[PDB]
Amino acid sequence: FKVNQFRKTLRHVKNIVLRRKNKERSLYDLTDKEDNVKPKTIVFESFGGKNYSDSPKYIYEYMQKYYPNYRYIWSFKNPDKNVVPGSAEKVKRNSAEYYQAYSEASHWVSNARTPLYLNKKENQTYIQTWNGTPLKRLANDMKVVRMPGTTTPKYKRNFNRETSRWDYLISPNRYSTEIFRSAFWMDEERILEIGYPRNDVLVNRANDQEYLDEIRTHLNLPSDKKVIMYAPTWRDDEFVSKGKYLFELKIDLDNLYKELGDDYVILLRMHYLISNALDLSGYENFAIDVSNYNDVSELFLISDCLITDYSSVMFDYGILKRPQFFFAYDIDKYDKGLRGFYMNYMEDLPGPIYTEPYGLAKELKNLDKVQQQYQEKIDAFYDRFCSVDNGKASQYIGDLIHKDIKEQLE
């Protein structure tokens, strides 16, 4: 009677007798043996099961088409509030079926850390797409982490533990690769430079019009109007009053309305807390709240330019060689010269840094002029970051997985 089993065993009796909600887990930890793995089961979860979205979605939609005959399982916080096309069946996180799915599967696909209490056996292949070309230092590369409940050495310890299990790790470029290699204690061997499966549409579908037209009318958009997308990153300094009434975005909608309300419509992609605290009465058909829209890649395809600040998205939107603007209004707060960025913000991004909305508004009046004026820099940026993207990524993984599970079938 082995000491490791005895421990798991007592823990479960505790959970069973005490009616702990965790019993579902302790039972799993016990019975989870290498033999439960059915070589043709695949589980997908995206952003820790809040969504059917991002690269796991596109890897899934590719495999549905060309490999219908596998068990496809999706993992969700609230399965019944998530709509999935196809042969996939869904599971609630932390439930009986959840641990089954994860025990049986030959392959794990996801774009974020999956929990450590989940047992990744030698048997199974865990493929990590992750969720973007980094601009802020992550994991190992961070210096201090005053994050509640844990120290920094511990938080790195646990991260290091997750990444050690990543059999494959996708990368959108050389620069992300070099970073991952250190940030995620990764081996170049295990890294796949192919680009993001979720970016595939940015290459394949950008000139598809019936498609652009759906997305546009699914959003009820003006027909004559060009589209600006605004997508600021989150900031604590701006959460006040429990989040009931916020101070109008510093971008100044009133102004943008006056200045561009006739040529443009503007898409506000905000953090969910800002979203449902944002009053847009008086801007109908001008500023559209687009914060809860399922698929961000679709929003990029219909955008004529992106306004952002410090985001992993500028790297995505780059694939389309369109104009970007960076409205870093609080940029002085951010550490004076901040090396807490991998890249050189001041120097090499595809657009102007504005710190005030009004130069930004004038500039927007005439896009074609910004496109020319910055064509040089857009290109340099496209070369450095977005050139790796075939439009073939979701196919490459779907095939890697297919090839993978032909062997196990013996």
- Residues near ligand C2G (CB under 6 A) are 54, 130-132, 134, 138, 231, 233, 269, 296, 311-313, 316
CB 128 within 8 A of CB 162: no
- To a copy of itself, the closest distance from the beta carbon of 156 in angstroms equals 11
Binding partner at 120 among ligand C2G, a copy of itself, Cl ion, none, C-beta below 5 to 8 Å by kind: Cl ion
Binding mask 19-58 for a copy of itself (x = CB under 8 A): --------x--xx-x-------------------------
CA gap 38, 124 in Å, rounded:
10
CB 307 within 8 A of CB 251: yes
Question: Mutual orientation of helices 3-18 and 23-31 as an angle, nearest 10°?
Answer: 150
Task: Kindly state whether residue 142 participates in binding a copy of itself, applying the rule CB under 8 A.
Answer: no
Task: Kindly state whether residue 337 participates in binding a copy of itself, applying the rule CB under 8 A.
Answer: no
Q: Please give the DSSP secondary-structure letter assigned to residue 270.
A: -
Size of site (CB under 8 A) for a copy of itself: 26
Radius of gyration for the alpha carbons in the chain, expressed in angstroms and rounded: 23
- To ligand C2G, the closest distance from the beta carbon of 186 in angstroms equals 13
Strand partners, 42: 72, 107
Binding partner at 20 among Cl ion, ligand C2G, a copy of itself, none, C-beta below 5 to 8 Å by kind: none
Task: Kindly state whether residue 280 participates in binding a copy of itself, applying the rule CB under 8 A.
Answer: no
Judged by CB, which is closer to a copy of itself: 12, or 322?
Answer: 12
* In the block, residue with structure tokens 């969910």: 272
Q: Please give the DSSP secondary-structure letter assigned to residue 189.
A: G
Task: Kindly state whether residue 174 participates in binding a copy of itself, applying the rule CB under 8 A.
Answer: no
- To a copy of itself, the closest distance from the beta carbon of 20 in angstroms equals 11
Q: Where are the alpha helices (DSSP H) in 124-183?
A: 152-163, 174-183
Binding mask 98-117 for Cl ion (x = CB under 5 A): --------------xx----
**What is the identity of the amino acid at 257?**
Y
Judged by CB, which is closer to ligand C2G: 73, or 314?
Answer: 314
Binding partner at 40 among a copy of itself, ligand C2G, Cl ion, none, C-beta below 5 to 8 Å by kind: Cl ion
Task: Kindly state whether residue 2 participates in binding a copy of itself, applying the rule CB under 8 A.
Answer: yes
Q: What is the DSSP track for 191-244?
A: EEES--GGGHHHHHSTT-HHHHHHHHHHTT--SS-EEEEE-PPP-GGG--GGGS
Residue 243 corresponds to which tokens in the numbers above? 């989040």
Task: Kindly state whether residue 83 participates in binding a copy of itself, applying the rule CB under 8 A.
Answer: no
CA gap 265, 253 in Å, rounded:
11
Q: Which element (helix H / strand E) includes 46?
A: none
Give the strand pairing for 191-193 and 168-171. parallel
- To ligand C2G, the closest distance from the beta carbon of 228 in angstroms equals 14
Task: Kindly state whether residue 6 participates in binding Cl ion, applying the rule CB under 5 A.
Answer: yes
CA gap 386, 318 in Å, rounded:
6
Binding partner at 83 among ligand C2G, a copy of itself, Cl ion, none, C-beta below 5 to 8 Å by kind: Cl ion
Binding partner at 280 among Cl ion, ligand C2G, a copy of itself, none, C-beta below 5 to 8 Å by kind: none
- To ligand C2G, the closest distance from the beta carbon of 406 in angstroms equals 31
Judged by CB, which is closer to a copy of itself: 31, or 294?
Answer: 31
Q: Which of 69, 122, 143, 149 binds a copy of itself (CB under 8 A)?
A: 149
Residue 346 neighbours by CB distance under 10 Å: 11
Judged by CB, which is closer to ligand C2G: 197, or 261?
Answer: 197
Strand partners, 326: 308, 353
CB 238 within 8 A of CB 309: no
Question: Mutual orientation of helices 253-260 and 357-364 as an angle, nearest 10°?
Answer: 20
CA gap 398, 75 in Å, rounded:
18
Binding partner at 253 among ligand C2G, Cl ion, a copy of itself, none, C-beta below 5 to 8 Å by kind: Cl ion
Binding site for Cl ion (CB under 5 A): 2-3, 5-6, 9, 22, 38-40, 78-80, 83-84, 112-113, 119-120, 132, 134, 150, 155, 158, 174-175, 248-249, 253, 312
